[PDB]
């Protein structure tokens, strides 16, 4: 998802009081609306309960290095929460997939959709489920009757772009409290007037 030619407020994204987790490095979470950026980048995917700790810069694992690498200059803003009553069902929900085997590392902010069978041995297999060859994409084990560390979590990352361009998607000026019957200073689009 790309956000352009839009204006939005992140205050309503925080008072939901329903997110199980919220992590956001690179900027203080209380001072990201007033600061203006150029582009807002958002990606949406599902993850298990034991892999939400893996979405961070500076570690190696199984998902953060084969599906979406996190660079060191990561000013992203990640949100995840539990919605297990809709993305899971009885009998085994295996609709979502993941990649487990990869030949080597990948550059961050790159998508890998290669369905080629990863070869472990020194001999070709020509696409067979035999020896020294395994299919890298594997199914999930989602179930609504699980505990807390293996439930389907809806995780998204909101990153910001800083280039030589004017601000496009950023917080507008906030609506402060209205005061009356006192000598105050105001400016309604045409004058810096002081008075009651």
């Amino acid at each position, epitope marked *: 998802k790309r956000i352009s030619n839009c204006v939005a407020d992140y205050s309503v994204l925080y008072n939901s009081a329903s997110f199980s987790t919220f992590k956001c490095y690179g900027v203080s979470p209380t001072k990201l609306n007033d600061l203006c950026f150029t582009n807002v980048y958002a990606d949406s995917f599902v993850i298990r309960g034991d892999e939400v700790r893996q979405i961070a810069p500076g570690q190696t694992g199984k998902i953060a290095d084969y599906n979406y690498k996190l660079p060191d200059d990561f000013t992203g803003c990640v949100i995840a929460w539990n919605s297990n009553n809709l993305d899971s069902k009885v009998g085994g929900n295996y609709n979502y997939l993941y990649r487990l085997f990869r030949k080597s590392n990948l550059k961050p*902010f*790159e998508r*890998d959709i290669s369905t080629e069978i990863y070869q472990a041995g020194s001999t070709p297999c020509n696409g067979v489920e035999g020896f020294n060859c395994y299919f890298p994409l594997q199914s999930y084990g989602f179930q609504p009757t699980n505990g807390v560390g293996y439930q389907p979590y809806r995780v998204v990352v909101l990153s910001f772009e800083l280039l030589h361009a004017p601000a496009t998607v950023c917080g507008p000026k906030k609506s402060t409290n209205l005061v009356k019957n006192k000598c105050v200073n105001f400016n309604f689009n045409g004058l810096t007037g002081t008075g009651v």
Partner: antibody, heavy 123, light 111 residues
Framework: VQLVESGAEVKKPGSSVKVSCKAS????????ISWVRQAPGQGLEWMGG????????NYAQKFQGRVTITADKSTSTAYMELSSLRSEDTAVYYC?????????????????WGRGTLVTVSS | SVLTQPPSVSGAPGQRVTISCTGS?????????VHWYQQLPGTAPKLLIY???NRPSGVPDRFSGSKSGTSASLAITGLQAEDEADYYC???????????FGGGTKLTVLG
């Protein structure tokens, strides 16, 4: 390789249509399988794709839970089931192939295509 | 739907013909690659170019694919006797959660 399909097939408005996607040779039991429909008068649409390895269905949000696609590993073939035919089914289906790669884009390219199945329904 | 294409384009046998494809900021301008296909009236469509950077086998070098940010363009040089088909834009759409095709352009002048 080459994919061969059946010919024209006509049913009544409200039956289930049954066609097959045959594959000659190999390279069918390793790569993803989808279906492409072309309609004269409008553009092409993509109903969904089925992986034959794990047997996982991946459809689109524009189509409801009415069509189902199954895969076979013994004879290297795919069957397509579609019930409750409506008045705008006069089109042709295609059995295509997906070949993923690595890159910043990572878009699904359709290099290998089927022959075509002319399914028309009317009074 | 989300992808719009011109109905028809005019050209001459020997000059450069360029088509322009415009979509949204979530399918083509987001960063996904585009794929172009030729719809001959009577035969199944085949692959022409994928990713606008690689040349598939059996496809002449005469076709060129470029992506000018949000819009993708295809350029050809010279009109031979097999361009009586339709050109479509195919790209992954995140909003539709699937592949969506374009409108289609007819390439004919007078015969």
């Amino acid at each position: 390789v080459q994919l061969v399909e059946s010919g024209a097939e006509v049913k009544k408005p409200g039956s289930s249509v049954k066609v097959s996607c045959k594959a000659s040779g190999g390279t069918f039991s390793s790569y993803a399988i989808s279906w492409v429909r072309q309609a004269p008068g409008q553009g092409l649409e993509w109903m969904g794709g089925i992986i034959p390895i794990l047997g996982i269905a991946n459809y689109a949000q524009k189509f409801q839970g009415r069509v189902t696609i199954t895969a076979d590993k013994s004879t290297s073939t795919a069957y397509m089931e579609l019930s409750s035919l409506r008045s705008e089914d006069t089109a042709v289906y295609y059995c295509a192939r997906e070949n993923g790669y690595s890159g910043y884009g990572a878009a699904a390219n359709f290099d290998l295509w089927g022959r075509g199945t002319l399914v028309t329904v009317s009074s | 739907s989300v992808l719009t294409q011109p109905p028809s384009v005019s050209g001459a046998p020997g000059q450069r013909v360029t088509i322009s494809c415009t979509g949204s900021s979530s399918n083509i301008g987001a960063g996904y690659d585009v794929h172009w296909y030729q719809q001959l009236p009577g035969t199944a469509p085949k692959l022409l170019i994928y990713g606008n950077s690689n040349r598939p086998s059996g496809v002449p070098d005469r076709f060129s694919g470029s992506k000018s940010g949000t819009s993708a363009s295809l350029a050809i040089t010279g009109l031979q006797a097999e361009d009586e088909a339709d050109y479509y834009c195919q790209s992954y759409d995140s909003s539709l959660s699937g592949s969506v095709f374009g409108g289609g352009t007819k390439l004919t002048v007078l015969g």
